[PDB]
Amino acid sequence: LEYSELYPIQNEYRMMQSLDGMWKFQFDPEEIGKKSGWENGLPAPVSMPVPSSFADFFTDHKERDYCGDFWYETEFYLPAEWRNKKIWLRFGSITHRGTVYCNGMEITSHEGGFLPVLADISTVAKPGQVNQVVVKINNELNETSLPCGATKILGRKLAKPYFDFFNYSGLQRSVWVIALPEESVKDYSVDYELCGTDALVKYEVVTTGEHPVIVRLLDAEGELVAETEGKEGILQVANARLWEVRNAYLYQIVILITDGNGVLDEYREKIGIRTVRIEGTKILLNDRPVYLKGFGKHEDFPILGRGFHWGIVKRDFECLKWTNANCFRTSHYPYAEEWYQFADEEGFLIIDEVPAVGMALTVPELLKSHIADTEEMITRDKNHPSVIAWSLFNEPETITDYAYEYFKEVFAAAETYDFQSRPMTGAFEKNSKPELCKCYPLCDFICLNRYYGWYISGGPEIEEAEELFRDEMDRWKAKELNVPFVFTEFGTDTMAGLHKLPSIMWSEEYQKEYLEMNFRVFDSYEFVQGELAWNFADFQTTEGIMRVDGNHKGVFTRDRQPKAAAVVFKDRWE
Amino acid sequence: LEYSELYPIQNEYRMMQSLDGMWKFQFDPEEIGKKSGWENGLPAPVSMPVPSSFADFFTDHKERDYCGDFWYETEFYLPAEWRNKKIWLRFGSITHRGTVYCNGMEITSHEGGFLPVLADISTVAKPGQVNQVVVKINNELNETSLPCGATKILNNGRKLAKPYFDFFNYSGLQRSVWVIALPEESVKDYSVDYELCGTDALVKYEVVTTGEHPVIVRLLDAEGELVAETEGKEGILQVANARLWEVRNAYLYQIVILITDGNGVLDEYREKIGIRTVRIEGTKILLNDRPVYLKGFGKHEDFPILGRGFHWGIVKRDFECLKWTNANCFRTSHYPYAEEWYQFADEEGFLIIDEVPAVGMMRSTRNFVEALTVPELLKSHIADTEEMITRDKNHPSVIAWSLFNEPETITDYAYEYFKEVFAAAETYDFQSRPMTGAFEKNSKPELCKCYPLCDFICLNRYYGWYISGGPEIEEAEELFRDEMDRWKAKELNVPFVFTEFGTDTMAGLHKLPSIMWSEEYQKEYLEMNFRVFDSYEFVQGELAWNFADFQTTEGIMRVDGNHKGVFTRDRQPKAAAVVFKDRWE
Q1: DSSP letter at A429?
Q2: Which of A370, A502, B301, B314 could be stapled to B308 by a disulfide with Cβ–Cβ 3.0 to 4.6 Å?
Q3: Residue-wise DSSP of B488-516
Q4: Strands across the sheet containing A185-195
Q5: Which ranges of B230-362 does DSSP label H, i.e. alpha helix?
Q6: Distance (Å, rounded) from C-alpha B109 to C-alpha B42?
Q7: Stretch (H or E) spanning B65
Q8: Which residues form the Glycosyl hydrolases family 2 sugar binding domain (chain A) (predicted)?
Q9: Which helix (H) or strand (E) element contains residue A93?
């Protein structure tokens, strides 16, 4: 990559300053901003919180549903001391695609709305002065970038997703301006081997120069436990304190660039010594089988939309721990980096998912976008101990040799980017029948999204649903694939407060009964090794006749309170 | 004050770095932290978001309801280039009281949970190194500090807050925290006051600095163009063809305050201000020499999960909802809000009644839930008043100070108490703008001794809810008119603003005919209240209780908090919201 994905830190060599706050903001329905000098400042802005999705602040439909080009602007004072450092704007994300300007100059553009955007403003930055950043953003959906959809023209544009979740957009994550030394740590990778009571931390370091590198490992108390020299090497850890499920331990890696007797740069990050591998039908963490228990989530909260906030992280993890979960999938896009940092702390397992949802010649361009997002996700997230698997798709077509050749390239790219070569998978929709699917052989383990008892034979037909479920799982069993299966979606829309005896679809009681039936099926097959329910919480969707204020398959409400079924998960996962 | 209330800025002379994020946090039920050295680091912390109230993250009662001592900790890297600066920790607030430590050393303590806490760490700060901050906080309620309440001790030693007020006892680090660096000689405070002279305006000012060097004051218009300049720590800026700050039509100048030594500039403070005058004339509230009728709400700092935690997103949604109702005003019930609320009101042209947390001074609810505590309470009350006014005086949005909410007012003792508060407020406010407080119904026109202290009178009344609700609503209207006729007959010639009126209203509860708690009853109640308001010339404002449903202590009279919101807690309109929109249009 032409930039670093490394999370920004502050020390003797690296500086950072937050640009979060109220930005200037303006819609550009006529698409004349770049024609009209907007990159030098917006002509008639309103204020817009950053980080946040813009949609749910407004009281009018056309602003909430805005689709097209729209602009952000802010000003920041740059400390004079940042002079002659490499100065970067770092956006947690820009959703979905955008062009960054600084002091009237075009800096960079990015496609993909859920991963960091880095813009090198070294040559245009004005140390000791007020600087200006302007971002042109677009939130349309197409079939050549992720996530896929269409754009309808009423000249007013309307996003038409091929995915369920609401098309939130804007500057949904924190924005920093940072300063790095001229020769810096750009990237590093760690991989682990367990040796009795000891451990090896294998590493590679990429810098922007040719000076020597020293790598140190500190324990949780900051004590030096290992040290070595070189951009490539092994850190030997005696009596290693392994990072364990729901029982984290984090070391601190310290990467130094040196020039004789002085340090040029120093990067530090918390990491966790752990191994993950698929062995037969088992998922092994540190050589012991683990059964995944948890949820698909979303970045979704009232008013903020996908806007990041530590308070949402904290509540969600307390709820997760209360259910006795150990895992979540980042459905259906990489989350803010902070979610992974916290999962590292709390010992949660993550399946990290690229926004390959909603899946013509456009396909070669789509593949490029999909591979680019995969590269960025893996480079960003590989050193989190929590991240134990990559999900490279959600419910694509998989039953043609055409689909096979496409995903072969994606998986091949993912493999080259992940230093750890940790398990890769994808979530299969029901149409990927065991007799037809061509893509499951690409996977280290198989993830199934199934709604037997909701979309199939729901309600009075739920007994039929269970037989149909068992019939499919019997077909999978007969294949003797010798791989683990994880259910990554299953659930029922459930309106909090809707009670019925006997239960009906949409009642709290039916949600319980549906889950109990699914558990019976899960527990009937030895090779099922994980259950991640859909969804952790009710979340916003495109409005329509099938969505009663978003998706109500949450086990929790949108404001994070338990429906009756939450207790069912709690008791089972205990 | 021994510190500056000025909002932090980033420029050539002043630096700031946010400490917001995930802090370490630990409850201290046995109160052993200090003797155990926790100021050097918490021994078994959990993670806690800052800014946020801590209560609503947890899944267990005892953590949510925790009352007593609890501790926060974080670490930060201090840029080497901050050496030879004055270095301060600035907490937007610390709720309710706390002691700030830095690098293991006690720095300062503060009482009052809703105003900035400044800690001078200059003598212990380590530039070019990681530094540590640890804060011991306490969230108990008592009768010698604001807001008032009691602390109950359960048989097993566990403490439980017992407020004398109807808002949940949220606490912790609810606002942003910065570490900042100032020049050794800096602008510490300034005040502006306005006079209108035809098409022109005068900006009278005072500047307080921490030194003796000369001061230069400039005023820039909204385009950054210089419109006035003068010299001296006291002076007058002459603005030709002034663009006044108007209700729901803001215009903001930028004041620029420079400290110089001739050779160069030592400090430069900048803030947006709005040229506007506020006065009471007879029964009229005059903004810029024209009557304004206040339309809006009492609010709260309250949102799901975050509690009172500050977030710009909440500000933005709330102001969009306010504008949609055609409101022009809110009261900061019942405590000063985060500074950002006022910054945004300035921008949006909203009027604010800024309220000190003098709530819970009602004898009835105290007894339900003194000679020696009242003198100490007065001191706390006056201190909070001084801090609020010093912090907020230069906002064009702030047009009035509310110095109490529903205290006892019918004794001569209460008069002497509030006489001192109002006297203090007057001396701290350079503008001497209107002062008021909100009166409960027990403050009968025949008995109240304190309303003469006010420049305009704010009434909290619930005729049709607590008094003669539902089938008796006709009687409620009669009783309401009876009281207002008594006020009318006093011919006080001052404006009256209703600062509370409303009904608990469950979203989705519909009934025909309406019942108390239904959406339809909220509408009917409001219509009845409007009919009464509109019958009296001297009524010049209506601020409904409340903007949005909000959290309270749980109990038999609170169904998941207070439901008198016109909006839900997640900021969506009940049926009554349109009633306000249509009326205020």
Answers
A1: P
A2: B301
A3: HHH-----EEEEE----B-TT---SS--T
A4: A185-195, A198-207, A232-237
A5: 312-324, 339-348
A6: 19
A7: none
A8: 16-181
A9: none
B→A interface, C-beta within 8 Å: 10-12, 15, 17-18, 21-22, 47-50, 52, 56-59, 76-77, 79-81, 128, 303-306, 309, 311-317, 320-321, 323-324, 344, 347, 570-571
What single DSSP character describes residue B548?
B
- Cβ contacts below 8 Å, chain A against chain B, sum to 101
Alpha-carbon distance A547 to B335, whole Å?
40
Tokens encoding A66: 């805005």
**What values do phi and psi take at A369, rounded to 5?**
-65, -40
Helices (H) and strands (E) in chain B, counts: 9, 30
What residue in A sits closest to B43 (Cα-Cα)? A221
Residue B155 in marked binding region: no
Given in angstroms, what resolution was this structure solved at? 1.7
Q: How many CB atoms lie within 10 A of CB A120?
A: 18
Helices within B372-448 (DSSP H only): 374-392, 412-428
Count CB-CB contacts under 10 A for residue A182: 12
The beta strands (E) that lie in B11-158 are given as: 15-18, 21-27, 46-50, 69-77, 86-91, 97-102, 105-111, 117-120, 130-138, 149-153
Q: How many angstroms separate the CA of residue B158 from the nearest CA in chain A?
A: 23
Q: Are strands B398-405 and B435-439 parallel, antiparallel or unpaired?
A: parallel
A407's tokens: 């995903």
In angstroms, rounded to a whole number, what is the distance separating the alpha carbons of residues A169 and A305? Answer: 9
The answer to whether B561 touches B569, Cβ cutoff 8 Å, is yes
* Residues 6+ away with beta carbon under 8 Å from B449: B409, B410, B411, B412, B414, B415
Bridge-based pairing of strands B15-18 and B177-182 is antiparallel
C-beta atoms surrounding B61 within 10 Å: 8
On whether the CB atoms of residues A129 and A121 are closer than 8 A, the answer is no
Question: Is A24 within 8 Å of A33 (Cβ atoms)?
Answer: no
Task: Give the type of residue at A336.
Answer: A
Tokens of A36: 């009209």
Mode of pairing for the β-strands spanning A288-289 and A485-489: unpaired
The amino acid at A540: Q
Residues of B in contact with A303 (CB under 8 A): 303, 313-314, 317, 570-571
Please give the Cα distance from A296 to A487 (Å, whole number): 10
DSSP B557-580: TBSSSB---SB-TTS-B-THHHHH
Q: Is the sign of the CA dihedral A314, A317, A321, A326 positive or negative?
A: negative
Query: DSSP of A317-359, one letter per residue?
Result: HHHHHHTT--EEE-TTSPPPHHHHHHHHHHT-EEEEE-S-B--
Q: In what order do the strands lie in the sheet with B200-209?
A: B187-197, B200-209, B234-239
Which residues in chain A are closer than 8 Å to B320, comparing Cβ atoms?
Answer: 57-59
User: How far apart, in whole angstroms, are the C-alpha atoms of residue B275 and residue B31?
Assistant: 50
